[PDB]
Amino acid sequence: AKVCYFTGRKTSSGNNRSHAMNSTKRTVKPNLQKVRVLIDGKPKKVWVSTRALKSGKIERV
Amino acid sequence: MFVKKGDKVKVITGKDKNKEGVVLAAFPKQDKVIVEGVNVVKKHQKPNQAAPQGGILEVEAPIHVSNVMVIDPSNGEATKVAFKEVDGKKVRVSKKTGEVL
RNA sequence: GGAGCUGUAAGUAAGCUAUGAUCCAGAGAUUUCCGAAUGGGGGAACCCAAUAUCUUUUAUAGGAUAUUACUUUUCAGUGAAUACAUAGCUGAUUAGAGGUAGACGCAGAGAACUGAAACAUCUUAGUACCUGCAGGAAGAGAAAGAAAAUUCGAUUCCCUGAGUAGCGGCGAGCGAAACGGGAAGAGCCCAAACCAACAAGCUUGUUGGGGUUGUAGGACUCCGAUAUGGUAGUCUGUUAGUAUAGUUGAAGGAUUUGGAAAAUUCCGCUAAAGAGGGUGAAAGCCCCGUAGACGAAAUGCUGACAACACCUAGGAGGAUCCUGAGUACGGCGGAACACGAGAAAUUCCGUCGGAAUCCGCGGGGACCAUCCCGCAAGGCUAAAUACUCCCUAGUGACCGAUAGUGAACCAGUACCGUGAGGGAAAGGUGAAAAGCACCCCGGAAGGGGAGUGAAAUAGAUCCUGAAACCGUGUGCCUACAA
RNA sequence: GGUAGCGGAGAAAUUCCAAACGAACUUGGAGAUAGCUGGUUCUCUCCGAAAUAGCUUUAGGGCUAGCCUCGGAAUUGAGAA
RNA sequence: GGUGUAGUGGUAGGAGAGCGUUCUAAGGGCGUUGAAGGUCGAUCGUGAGGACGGCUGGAGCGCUUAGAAGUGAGAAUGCCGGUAUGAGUAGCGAAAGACAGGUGAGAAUCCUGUCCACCGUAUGACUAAGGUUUCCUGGGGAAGGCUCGUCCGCCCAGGGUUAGUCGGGACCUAAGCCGAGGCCGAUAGGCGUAGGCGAUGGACAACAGGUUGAUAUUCCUGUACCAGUUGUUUUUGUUUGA
RNA sequence: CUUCUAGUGAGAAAACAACUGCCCGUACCGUAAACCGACACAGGUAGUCGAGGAGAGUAUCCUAAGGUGAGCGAGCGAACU
RNA sequence: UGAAAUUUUAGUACCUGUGAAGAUGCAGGUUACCCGCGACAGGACGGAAAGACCCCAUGGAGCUUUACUGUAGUUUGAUAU
Ligand SMILES: [K+]
Ligand SMILES: [K+]
Ligand SMILES: [K+]
Ligand SMILES: [K+]
Ligand SMILES: [K+]
Ligand SMILES: [K+]
Ligand SMILES: [K+]
Ligand SMILES: [K+]
Ligand SMILES: [K+]
Ligand SMILES: [K+]
Ligand SMILES: [K+]
Ligand SMILES: [K+]
Ligand SMILES: [K+]
Ligand SMILES: [K+]
Ligand SMILES: [K+]
Ligand SMILES: [K+]
Ligand SMILES: [K+]
Ligand SMILES: [K+]
Ligand SMILES: [K+]
Ligand SMILES: [K+]
Ligand SMILES: [K+]
Ligand SMILES: [K+]
Ligand SMILES: [K+]
Ligand SMILES: [K+]
Ligand SMILES: [K+]
Ligand SMILES: [K+]
Ligand SMILES: [K+]
Ligand SMILES: [K+]
Ligand SMILES: [K+]
Ligand SMILES: [K+]
Ligand SMILES: [K+]
Ligand SMILES: [K+]
Ligand SMILES: [K+]
Ligand SMILES: [Mg+2]
Ligand SMILES: [Mg+2]
Ligand SMILES: [Mg+2]
Ligand SMILES: [Mg+2]
Ligand SMILES: [Mg+2]
Ligand SMILES: [Mg+2]
Ligand SMILES: [Mg+2]
Ligand SMILES: [Mg+2]
Ligand SMILES: [Mg+2]
Ligand SMILES: [Mg+2]
Ligand SMILES: [Mg+2]
Ligand SMILES: [Mg+2]
Ligand SMILES: [Mg+2]
Ligand SMILES: [Mg+2]
Ligand SMILES: [Mg+2]
Ligand SMILES: [Mg+2]
Ligand SMILES: [Mg+2]
Ligand SMILES: [Mg+2]
Ligand SMILES: [Mg+2]
Ligand SMILES: [Mg+2]
Ligand SMILES: [Mg+2]
Ligand SMILES: [Mg+2]
Ligand SMILES: [Mg+2]
Ligand SMILES: [Mg+2]
Ligand SMILES: [Mg+2]
Ligand SMILES: [Mg+2]
Ligand SMILES: [Mg+2]
Ligand SMILES: [Mg+2]
Ligand SMILES: [Mg+2]
Ligand SMILES: [Mg+2]
Ligand SMILES: [Mg+2]
Ligand SMILES: [Mg+2]
Ligand SMILES: [Mg+2]
Ligand SMILES: [Mg+2]
Ligand SMILES: [Mg+2]
Ligand SMILES: [Mg+2]
Ligand SMILES: [Mg+2]
Ligand SMILES: [Mg+2]
Ligand SMILES: [Mg+2]
Ligand SMILES: [Mg+2]
Ligand SMILES: [Mg+2]
Ligand SMILES: [Mg+2]
Ligand SMILES: [Mg+2]
Ligand SMILES: [Mg+2]
Ligand SMILES: [Mg+2]
Ligand SMILES: [Mg+2]
Known part of the structure; x- marks a missing residue:
């Protein structure tokens, strides 16, 4: 699925809160990027x- | 059943009370038994059973096992039955006399 | 276990059984086809294959057996663009798929009617539904805690705190926690420092040791002990008990009514058994039982014992080193905390920024100082707790055939619908079929006799047999009345 | 054979989507809500109203008061004619 | 308890006291010499209601005190069942039948015969789907058939569908569908390559007659064709190799 | 299916004789009383054949092959429809 | 052979009047022997459908828009990649 391969960050659901505090469901996605990395x-x-x-500990081959 | 085919039993309840006879047949599932000359019924048979008259046949009908008592052969009296193992064999015993069967 | 048995289920027919049948319990064999269905295909229960062995035929055709899905794990060989490689491909190896119990648990996603007497915040409600993952329980759990009586010492659940403190278009409503009392109780492992080995490229990965913490601990350095205890391990036995068949188990005869005695009456008897059921009416003593005693070849389950296994060190020093980082935390946007951004801590998600590290760090409801308490960013953990599709044994001021399950009966059936789906009606002869031989009218059906039966106005539409409704007979009345 | 209901399809009529389509059918939330209509089963004894005021997004609803009933307390007896 | 006085219509509604139903406890009873239930009666009480007889019935049930409720129906266009009224009424669903003979308990309706009549680009003959035994033979007349029925597509018992060539599969593909890997995606899944599935299309070897009560390009007779195996014979090639 | 080579190849071809050739469907109704319409229902149901006279014709009328006489009737011969 | 809608029980007249204001059923009077059959449709405010018109409910639904509050999309900026 569309899941961060290392930290498991994934799409979740949140709320849109208007000034009147009306609530509607929304999807909150992580900032995923397709990256060529050395696995095994x-x-x-x-x-x-x-x-x-960010930490730079992830390979960027 | 505490009674067995071929035993001599005494009818203790029913229209034929005090009659005695040999057990012609036993029905453990129904807990019933047939005693010769006991509980005779008249049955209006068609001639379909190799009887070219049909006629009104007489036959003993089963009676409940609890309405009979085994005849103590040695004494000829009706008795209750206990179970004692004799010579390694489990057998019936007359509570009134200790006789076997 | 000991005499019948071949289910319902009669009837024939043919048989089995003291050489022990039927039947009951344990273990095992077989177990077609479909179905995750998996050799391929497919409109489920069907069709068509490949490989190898075997089989039929003179031979082809035919038949049987075994293997042949996909993905994951590990290994091996092959092996591109491309040189090495890698990818792919082949084989072997490994463990998954699917179903449930309409219950219980955790998580993702997540309504509306409704309430607010309208309605949007709010409420219904993190409910219903959907999806994932489960386990017999789950989840939580070994303090960066609760507190400030001075202290307590993991977690869970029950009582209480309390409809309190609070939250809230401060409306409707929502609504704690700690203390206290109980159920149950249990605590343990790593990462790191450092050491030894290994390998490559003085560090840097693998291995083993080491070590595990807040009255700071540990490394490291000195000393002294090589014990002492424990365990939440093991298809390791030995042993006991227990579950799954069973054996035994006391004591009544008469008299009256009756078709039938258990009822009535008269005398008895038994009781560690007067629970209950059945038997021709209401049985302590007729039967099955009950009290009580006894019983297991085989297979599970539990408990002990042993074995094996795994954990289990004290003291003194700090010179130095280690004690969980893109983490904690902050801005922005959401969410969870009873707490709806509010003065708002605490917890979590997304995004961006982004620490300290023992003279350190977090918390004590904004925030700061002091004081107190604790030591996050790693993991595991039984018991008390929730639930019952099932199995065993029981219970009920629970139902008794329009009730009780929809279903007491061949019911999720008949029937309805393209389908999802909806969904009935229907129990009672008699003690025993003894279920009316024979005769008579009639083509039969159905009756009348004759029989069975205590009773047939109990005759199978069969217990009782109400009312509506229909009809026969007639005591009185009725054809000048609104 | 394909398109499926927060939808499809429509030479366009709110027209068709399994004999009722301004939003199919089935199951579930669910016993939705209903200030509205209907219904609510034995008897006798004692007493016995109201259809008014005020306020109301209130007017055929509701709340307090007024009027009824049951029990109680007390009084310098306060009521009625 | 007696006397006296006063009072006693009543909806919403308040209060009080009772009747009856099922079940529990205790006590005390009744029942094949007939319980409950049903039915009839001219019976008792102020009311709900309570007895007692006769008949029916055939096995359970009262009474007293207390207790608990699925505790009382006449109405809800209430639900279910039964049966009425309308009413011997509407209707009996497009059209021609007549008679003789037969069968039989019974015939407008069944069989046979004769004439008549109807359809005839059909109301005839084949087939696909669909239905799924309705086909044939022998019985039956409960129910079904809008009458009747001796008869039926009904009931009962037996029986009937024969393929190398026909249609389908072991052949091919279209639309569409499934889809190894793969792409995408809170979950579930969505999409799709290779490869497959999928006829309504392409490809493909047999016809005539006869036979049964029921099958026929399937069985039989005759005469064929298609794919292949074995074997006999005949030719020709064996690695400059058909 | 026909060709082409690539490959493969020690056997091929012809005639003749004998022999082999699997599974599924095959009944019956089918402009209907057997299918879709709750019915033995005046409706609906793809394809093929579908004759003669007159006729352009499958129109029309009457007929052939062939099929059928319609599952309530007997009287009477009013209103009214 | 054999239904159905309807149906509180009905021994089910007319006039004038009365009455919830339009009576087969009430009052006064009048008329009328008992039971049917074939016809007609004035009445039973006849049957069928808890009026669709009208009004009401702090009901529902579909639709509109410069109604209110949101929101999918579209676009613009900051920021990460
Ligand atoms: K399958
Ligand atoms: K369950
Ligand atoms: K709402
Ligand atoms: K409201
Ligand atoms: K756990
Ligand atoms: K409370
Ligand atoms: K409010
Ligand atoms: K250690
Ligand atoms: K007995
Ligand atoms: K007994
Ligand atoms: K054992
Ligand atoms: K907060
Ligand atoms: K704190
Ligand atoms: K603390
Ligand atoms: K009887
Ligand atoms: K009479
Ligand atoms: K159209
Ligand atoms: K009586
Ligand atoms: K009613
Ligand atoms: K009727
Ligand atoms: K009638
Ligand atoms: K016949
Ligand atoms: K074929
Ligand atoms: K075809
Ligand atoms: K055939
Ligand atoms: K012509
Ligand atoms: K013609
Ligand atoms: K006829
Ligand atoms: K006439
Ligand atoms: K006329
Ligand atoms: K009125
Ligand atoms: K009329
Ligand atoms: K509408
Ligand atoms: Mg044995
Ligand atoms: Mg398969
Ligand atoms: Mg509301
Ligand atoms: Mg498990
Ligand atoms: Mg005994
Ligand atoms: Mg006695
Ligand atoms: Mg909150
Ligand atoms: Mg943040
Ligand atoms: Mg903080
Ligand atoms: Mg401390
Ligand atoms: Mg636990
Ligand atoms: Mg029932
Ligand atoms: Mg009953
Ligand atoms: Mg039911
Ligand atoms: Mg009788
Ligand atoms: Mg009866
Ligand atoms: Mg007169
Ligand atoms: Mg007179
Ligand atoms: Mg319009
Ligand atoms: Mg329609
Ligand atoms: Mg709800
Ligand atoms: Mg009064
Ligand atoms: Mg009075
Ligand atoms: Mg009773
Ligand atoms: Mg009730
Ligand atoms: Mg009623
Ligand atoms: Mg009439
Ligand atoms: Mg007709
Ligand atoms: Mg024509
Ligand atoms: Mg036939
Ligand atoms: Mg026949
Ligand atoms: Mg008939
Ligand atoms: Mg073919
Ligand atoms: Mg696909
Ligand atoms: Mg895949
Ligand atoms: Mg062909
Ligand atoms: Mg035929
Ligand atoms: Mg045929
Ligand atoms: Mg028709
Ligand atoms: Mg003609
Ligand atoms: Mg008037
Ligand atoms: Mg008038
Ligand atoms: Mg009158
Ligand atoms: Mg009237
Ligand atoms: Mg009307
Ligand atoms: Mg109305």
């Missing part, structure tokens, strides 16, 4: 969140 020594394109990449 073989490069692959997987979904990765910008937060995971």
Whole structure:
């Protein structure tokens, strides 16, 4: 699915709150990016969140 | 059943009370028994049973097992039956005399 | 277990059974086809294959057996663009799929009617529904806690706090927690520092040791002990008990009514058994039972015992090192906390920014100082708790055939609908079929006799047999009345 | 054979979507809500109204008061004619 | 308890006291010498209601005190069942039948015969779907048939569908559908490549006659064709190789 | 299906004789009393054949092959429809 | 052979009047022997359908828009990649 390959961040549901506090359901998605990374020594394109990449600990082959 | 085919029994209840006879047949599932010359019924038969008259046949009908008592063969009296193992064999015993069967 | 048995289910027919049948319990064998269905296909219960062995035929055709899905794990070989490689492909190996119990648990997603006497915040409600994952329970759980009586010492659940404190178009409503009393109780592992080995490329990964914490702990350095205890382990036995068949189990005869005695009457007897059911009416003593005693080849379950297994060290020093980072936390936007952004802590999600590290860090409801309490960003953990599709044994001032399950009866049937789906009606002869032989009218049906039966106006539409409704007979009245 | 209800399809009529379509059918939320209509089963004894005021998104609803009933307390007896 | 005085219509509604139903407890009873229930009666009480007889019935049931309620029906266009009224009424669903003979308990209605009449681009003959035994033979007349019925597409008992060539499969594909990997996506899943499935189309070897009560390009007779196996014979090729 | 080579190849071809050839459907109704309409229902139901005279004709009338006489009737011969 | 709608029980007249104001059923009077059959449709405010017109309910639904509050989309900026 569309899930961060390393941290598991995934789409969830939230609320839209108007000034009158009317509530309607919305979807809140993580900032995923397709990235070519070395998994088990073989490069692959997987979904990765910008937060995971932030530390720089994620390979960027 | 505490009574068995071929036993001599005494009828203790029913129209034939105090009669005695041999057990012609036993029906454990129904808990009933047939005693010769006991509880005779007249049955209006068609001639369809190899009887070229139909006629009104006489036959003993079963009676409930609890309405009979086994005849103590040695004494000839009706008795209740206990169970004692004799010579490694489980057998019936007359509570009135201790006789077997 | 010990005499009948071949279900319902009669009837024939043919048989089995003391060489122990039928029947009951344990274990095992077989178990067509469809179905996750998996060799391929398919409109389920059907069709068509490949490989290898076997089989029929002189031979083809035919038949049987085994293997042949997909993905995941590990391994091996092959092997592109491309040189090495990798990918792909082949094989072997590994464990998943699906169904449930219309229950219980956790999670993702998540209404509306309704209430507010309208309605949008709010309420219904994180409910119904859907989906995922489960386990016999789940979830939680070993304090960056509760507190400030001075103290308590994991979690869960019950009572109480209390309809309180609070939240709330401050409306309608929503609504705690701690303390206190109980049920039950249990605590443990890593990461890191550091050490030894291994391998490559003085560090850097693998392995083993090491170590696990807040009255700070640990490494490290000195000392001294190589014990002491424990466990939530094991298809390890041995043993006991228990579940799944069973055996035994006391004591009544007469008299009256009756078709039939258990009822009546007269004398008895038994009781560790006077629970209950059946038997021709109401039985302590007729039967099945009950009290009580006894019983297991086989297979589970539990408990013990042992074995194996796994954990289990004290003291003194701090010079130095370690103690969980894109984490905690902050801005923005949501959400959970009884708490609807509010003065708003605490918890969580998305996004962006982004620490300290023992002189350290978090919390005590904005925030700061002091004080107190604790040590996050890693994991596991029984019991008390929730539920019952099922199995066993019982209970009921629960129903008694329009009731009680929709279904007491061949019911989720008949029937209805394209389908999802909706969904009935229908129990009672008699003690025993003894279910009316024979005769008579009639083509039969159906009757009248004759019989069975205590009773046939109990005759199978069969207990009782109300009312509506229909008809026969007639005591009185009725054809000048509104 | 395909398109399915927050929809489809429509040479367009709110027209068709399994004999009723301004939003199919079935099951569930669900015993929706109904200030509205209907119904609510034995007897006797004692007493016995109201159809008014005020306010109301209130007017055939409701709340307090007025009028009825049952029990109680007390009084310098306060009521009626 | 007696006397006296006063009072006693009543909807909404308040209060009080009772009747009856089922069940529980206790006590005390009744029942095949007939319980409950049903039915009839000219019976008792102030009311709900309570007795007692006769008959029916055939096995359970009162009474007293207390207790608990699925505790009382006449109305809800209430639900279910039964039966009425309308009423011996509407209707008996497009059209021609007549008679003789037969069968039989029974005939307008069944069979046979004769004449008559109707359809005849059909009301005839084949087939696909659909139905699923309704087909044939022998019985039956309960129910079904809008009458009747001796008869039936009904009931009962037996029996009937024969393929190398026909249609389908072991052949092909269209639309559409499924879909290894793959893409996408809160979950579920959506989409789709390879590859498959899928006729209404393409491809494909047999016809004539006869036979049964019921099958026929299926059985039989005659005469064929298509794919293949074995074998005999005949030719020709064996690795410059058909 | 026909060709082409690539590959494959020690057997091929012809005639003749004998022999082999699996599964599923096959009954019956089918402009209907057997299918869709709750009915033995004046409705609906794809395709093929579908004759003669007159006729352009499958129109029309009467007929052939063939099928059928319609599952309540007997009287009477009023109103009214 | 054999239904159905309807139906509180009916021994079911006329006039004038009365009455919830339009009577087969009430009052006064009048007329009328009992039971049917074939016809007609004035009445039973006849049957069928809890009026669709009208009004009401702090009912419902579909629709409109510069009604209120939201929102899918579309677009613009900041920020991450
Ligand atoms: K399958
Ligand atoms: K359950
Ligand atoms: K709402
Ligand atoms: K309201
Ligand atoms: K757990
Ligand atoms: K409370
Ligand atoms: K309010
Ligand atoms: K250790
Ligand atoms: K007995
Ligand atoms: K007994
Ligand atoms: K055992
Ligand atoms: K907050
Ligand atoms: K705190
Ligand atoms: K603390
Ligand atoms: K009887
Ligand atoms: K009479
Ligand atoms: K149209
Ligand atoms: K009586
Ligand atoms: K009623
Ligand atoms: K009727
Ligand atoms: K009638
Ligand atoms: K016949
Ligand atoms: K074929
Ligand atoms: K075809
Ligand atoms: K055939
Ligand atoms: K011509
Ligand atoms: K013609
Ligand atoms: K006829
Ligand atoms: K006439
Ligand atoms: K006329
Ligand atoms: K009126
Ligand atoms: K009229
Ligand atoms: K509407
Ligand atoms: Mg044995
Ligand atoms: Mg398969
Ligand atoms: Mg509201
Ligand atoms: Mg399990
Ligand atoms: Mg005994
Ligand atoms: Mg006695
Ligand atoms: Mg909240
Ligand atoms: Mg944040
Ligand atoms: Mg904080
Ligand atoms: Mg401390
Ligand atoms: Mg637990
Ligand atoms: Mg029932
Ligand atoms: Mg009954
Ligand atoms: Mg029912
Ligand atoms: Mg009688
Ligand atoms: Mg009867
Ligand atoms: Mg006169
Ligand atoms: Mg007179
Ligand atoms: Mg319009
Ligand atoms: Mg329609
Ligand atoms: Mg609700
Ligand atoms: Mg009064
Ligand atoms: Mg008075
Ligand atoms: Mg009773
Ligand atoms: Mg009741
Ligand atoms: Mg009634
Ligand atoms: Mg009439
Ligand atoms: Mg007709
Ligand atoms: Mg014509
Ligand atoms: Mg026939
Ligand atoms: Mg026949
Ligand atoms: Mg008939
Ligand atoms: Mg073919
Ligand atoms: Mg697909
Ligand atoms: Mg896939
Ligand atoms: Mg062909
Ligand atoms: Mg035929
Ligand atoms: Mg045929
Ligand atoms: Mg027809
Ligand atoms: Mg003609
Ligand atoms: Mg008037
Ligand atoms: Mg008048
Ligand atoms: Mg009168
Ligand atoms: Mg009237
Ligand atoms: Mg009317
Ligand atoms: Mg109305």
